[PDB]
Design a protein around this ligand. Structure first.
Ligand SMILES: O=S(=O)(O)c1cc2c(O)c(c1)Cc1cc(S(=O)(=O)O)cc(c1O)Cc1cc(S(=O)(=O)O)cc(c1O)Cc1cc(S(=O)(=O)O)cc(c1O)C2
Ligand SMILES: O=S(=O)(O)c1cc2c(O)c(c1)Cc1cc(S(=O)(=O)O)cc(c1O)Cc1cc(S(=O)(=O)O)cc(c1O)Cc1cc(S(=O)(=O)O)cc(c1O)C2
Length: 129
């Protein structure tokens, strides 16, 4: 499913992401915009042979199993394909583990490149939350 911006903002708020590990909701929405374009089925291959999966582009080296990635640790204990459903729950639950691990949101490249340090509240303005 491709979420609308405000639709995803409400869904992320419903999943308790607002200020999760201190990251305001706008951070999460901005991350999803530039990671997946709000598309729950997005997949993108990386240089190290890993692939990023779903709405938050969770990586197959450390977080989920896709059977083709070197150095696989599968820390969310899930097939990567399970992070591609229309509901954001599995992605959120894995993201909560990732963002708690010590590096915060710096795990997400598109978030670092496009969202970090910016006025991320722009991403939730005008949304019914
Ligand atoms: O209409 S939507 O495009 O928003 C939609 C999104 C999702 C969907 O799975 C469905 C529709 C199909 C669907 C329809 C219905 S219906 O009302 O009978 O037509 C019911 C369900 C369903 O999956 C079952 C369902 C209901 C609810 S609740 O009504 O809000 O309690 C939640 C879910 C359900 O599967 C989980 C869910 C959450 C989310 S979230 O936006 O990430 O929270 C997205 C989708 C989900 O299926 C993903
Ligand atoms: O987030 S959405 O993109 O889905 C959206 C839906 C609707 C919208 O009207 C708006 C956005 C714009 C909007 C945003 C805000 S904000 O909270 O400041 O971001 C406020 C309004 C508004 O129209 C004005 C408004 C206020 C209230 S209040 O709770 O009584 O203060 C209710 C409404 C408002 O329009 C009615 C309303 C509720 C809803 S809701 O999703 O059921 O809450 C959606 C839409 C509505 O027009 C229909």
């Amino acid at each position: 499913k491709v979420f609308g911006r405000c639709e995803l903002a409400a869904a992320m708020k419903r999943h308790g992401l607002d200020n999760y590990r201190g990251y305001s909701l706008g951070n999460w929405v901005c991350a999803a915009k530039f990671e997946s374009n709000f598309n729950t089925q997005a997949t993108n291959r990386n240089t190290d042979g890993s692939t990023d999966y779903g709405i938050l582009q969770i990586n197959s080296r450390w977080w989920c199993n896709d059977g083709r990635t070197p150095g696989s640790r599968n820390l969310c204990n899930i097939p990567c394909s399970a992070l591609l459903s229309s509901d954001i729950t599995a992605s959120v639950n894995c993201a909560k583990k990732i963002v708690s691990d010590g590096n915060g949101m710096n795990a997400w490249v598109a978030w670092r490149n496009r969202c970090k340090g910016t006025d991320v509240q722009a991403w939730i303005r005008g949304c019914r939350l």
